[PDB]
């Protein structure tokens, strides 16, 4: 086969290490440790990682390398009745890009905003603050931090949106950042993985540089140890609570991202007899390693806020963009050489997102190249049209009420969509295709069959591991709300369409492939359950 292949082996490694390590390593794993019994949280985290995630992480990386094709084709050549999986997985990757790149633009607008000596978000006597302001985070909502009013009232101007319907003015300073993002994408992966494979060196290694700097300045700070205590001081009571084994199980899933079509796409250019098993374990480790490390960077600074700046930690130990955009920038502002910690930090946050946004694009570009060769013969040109659809719709997220539109996509674009999709991937591979077939495939590739441990995690554990999350994840349904803004019933119904528009293509192309073929039913499933390689 004249397929392409990674210019170097590190280009595949750093392309995967970068897709996996993003802001959720910096902002949701330290919170989960802090909230759920400290270091003791590492137990259910590691258990849910050992039996549920890395099993799944391994399974996809091996498939992608072996079946050598992108996400759509690789499920047609494996179980044709379930070719719809590849279609679902790809537009989910299409939907996410409608908001994921915005979070990078926020970083870039803060990076551009950190070119000064008095960082704007530190003082509360500016044109955008309110009389109900505090210089640092508190626990009353009418009174927000000076670094949180700079975010909601100047950077986002969310105070000028009465809801989802009131998008209000397009803010072009943010639009110009969203373009700088999609341009940073295009010229880094238009010509192929010949160049994307190299681009990821800066964007995947630079965070580790900024981490080591911020890990030193964080740890060499008055009150730095007090943070490390709140991070890891073990309370094994939380072990008992099953609400913690869901938070471990759900964080392991989205932090590694198996069954997303990316690792499959990235492996499809791997050389056949490459030891993917080694790559799976080495890659997965550097992931959870970076999150454990990153909690030290965050919570060293987070302890310094409590001891020096006089805040209750439960008021600064937050998750999500509030931490990287309000809380941590607020403590940077108090440190000497603050303009330096600002720039590396936001240039960290940006690079943390780019590698991961690269993977989403490629899973779409590769799945389409490997099926509609008009796309393949016209790569450079195709991507232009793709990223422009992103930018144009993305202008809806650069308005004043932009956040409300993002929050909807954060919840529905790829929420319950992907969880069922991967459940059908585990079922399609461990059961319909066959671990019998699958292990025989791997042995031909790397030289040995997967240990009976892996086979068992693939066939039973992972399906009930995914089931564990979707069940305990539907039990906690609440209508979409931000602050007091209750999203209207038609906005959820809309978000249900984009959540359905993925999963529906599983029984759709199951039905369409059934009806489009000749024979009798057991002759029907047999013809649609025997793979191409067979």
């Amino acid at each position, epitope marked *: 086969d004249e397929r392409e292949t990674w210019s170097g082996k590190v280009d595949f490694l750093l392309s995967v290490i970068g897709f996996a390590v993003d802001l959720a390593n910096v902002w949701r794993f330290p919170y989960l440790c802090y909230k759920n019994g400290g270091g003791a949280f590492l137990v259910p985290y590691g258990i849910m990682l050992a039996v549920g995630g890395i099993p799944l992480f391994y399974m996809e990386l091996a498939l992608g390398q072996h079946n050598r094709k992108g996400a759509i084709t690789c499920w047609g050549r494996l179980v044709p009745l379930f070719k719809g999986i590849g279609y679902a997985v790809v537009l989910i990757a299409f939907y996410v890009g409608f908001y994921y790149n915005v979070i990078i633009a926020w970083s870039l607008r803060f990076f551009f905003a950190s070119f000064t000596n008095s960082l704007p978000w530190t003082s509360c006597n500016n044109i955008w603050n309110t009389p109900n302001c505090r210089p640092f985070e508190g626990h009353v909502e009418g009174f927000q931090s000076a670094a949180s009013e700079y975010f909601n009232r100047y950077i986002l101007e969310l105070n000028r949106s009465e809801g989802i319907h009131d998008l209000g003015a397009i803010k072009w300073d943010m639009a110009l950042c969203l373009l700088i993002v999609y341009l940073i994408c295009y010229f880094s992966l238009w010509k192929g993985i010949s160049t994307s494979g190299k681009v990821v060196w800066f964007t995947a290694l630079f965070p580790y540089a900024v981490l080591l700097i911020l890990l030193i300045r964080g740890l060499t700070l008055p009150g730095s140890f007090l943070g490390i205590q709140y991070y890891l001081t073990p309370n094994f009571s939380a072990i008992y609570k099953a609400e913690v084994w869901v938070d471990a199980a759900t964080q392991v899933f989205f932090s590694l991202g198996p069954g997303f079509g990316v690792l499959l796409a990235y492996a499809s250019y791997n050389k056949y007899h490459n030891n993917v098993y080694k790559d799976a374990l080495l890659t997965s480790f550097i992931n959870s390693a970076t999150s454990f490390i990153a909690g030290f960077v965050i919570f060293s600074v987070l302890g310094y806020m409590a001891h020096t700046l006089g805040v209750r930690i439960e008021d600064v130990a937050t998750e999500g963009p509030g931490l990287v955009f309000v809380v941590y920038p607020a403590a940077i502002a108090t440190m000497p050489a603050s303009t330096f910690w600002a720039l590396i930090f936001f240039m960290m946050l940006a690079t943390l997102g780019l590698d991961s946004s690269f993977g989403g694009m490629e899973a779409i570009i590769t799945a389409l190249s490997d099926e509609f060769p008009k796309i393949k013969r016209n790569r450079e040109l195709f991507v232009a049209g793709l990223f422009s659809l992103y930018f144009v719709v993305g202008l809806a997220s650069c308005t004043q009420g932009g956040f409300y539109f993002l929050h909807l996509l954060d919840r529905y674009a790829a929420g319950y969509s992907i969880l069922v999709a991967v459940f059908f991937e585990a079922i399609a591979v461990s059961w319909i295709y066959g671990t019998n*077939r699958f292990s*025989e495939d791997i*042995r*031909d590739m790397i030289g040995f069959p997967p240990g009976r441990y892996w086979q068992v995690c693939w066939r039973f554990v992972a399906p009930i591991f995914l089931l564990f999350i979707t069940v305990y994840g539907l039990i906690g349904y609440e209508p979409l709300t931000y602050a007091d803004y209750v999203y209207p019933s038609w906005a959820n119904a809309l978000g249900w369409c984009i959540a359905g528009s993925s999963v529906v293509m599983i029984p759709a192309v199951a039905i369409f492939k059934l009806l489009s073929t000749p024979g009798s039913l057991r002759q029907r499933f047999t013809i649609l359950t025997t793979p191409w390689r067979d």
Partner: antibody
Amino acid sequence: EVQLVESGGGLVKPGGSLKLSCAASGFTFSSYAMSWVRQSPEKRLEWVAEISSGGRYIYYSDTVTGRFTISRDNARNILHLEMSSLRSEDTAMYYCARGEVRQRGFDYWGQGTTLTVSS
Amino acid sequence: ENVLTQSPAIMSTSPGEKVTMTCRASSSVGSSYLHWYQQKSGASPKLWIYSTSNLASGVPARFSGSGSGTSYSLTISSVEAEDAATYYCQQFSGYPLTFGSGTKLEMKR
């Protein structure tokens, strides 16, 4: 324990066609790739064919390719080898060697069966 | 094809002595794939050393194995006469799989 038994084979006229059989017992024959290794009367070992466990990956030596066929009956636990256009340099004792892990080699070897090709 | 040659061809040794045999590949071979088989006069071969150094179950600890790249060796510390055999190396990295010429260890008297 694990044990393999090669069977069939004897005298064959050149150009003829003989089929050998290796009866596995003492382990899950379905889980292990087998391979056929032959040894000439000059005591030099030579690999012939390999078949994956499910039988969907089959590698031939460049010598025997197109002439031999290594099939595999995971029902009855029998490994096969179908020979056609038999030449005289095919004369050897044929071994049925169990190897699944390349990094471990051929775990177990059968007694062997003797092919003599001579007009 | 990856041609393997072993030396010496024949080797007479007094029991208790130390013997070394070498296996040299025409193409390079990854260390994890070169194995060693012991075959007694008129018996089926037996897997002896797998992946350069690891002895197989039943192989006395008097046997060692080393090497890398294009040159590997099998070394017997102190031989007894129950080790008179012919020893073959084998590579499992690429197809066709190839066996070496073998060394015939004979007892000296």
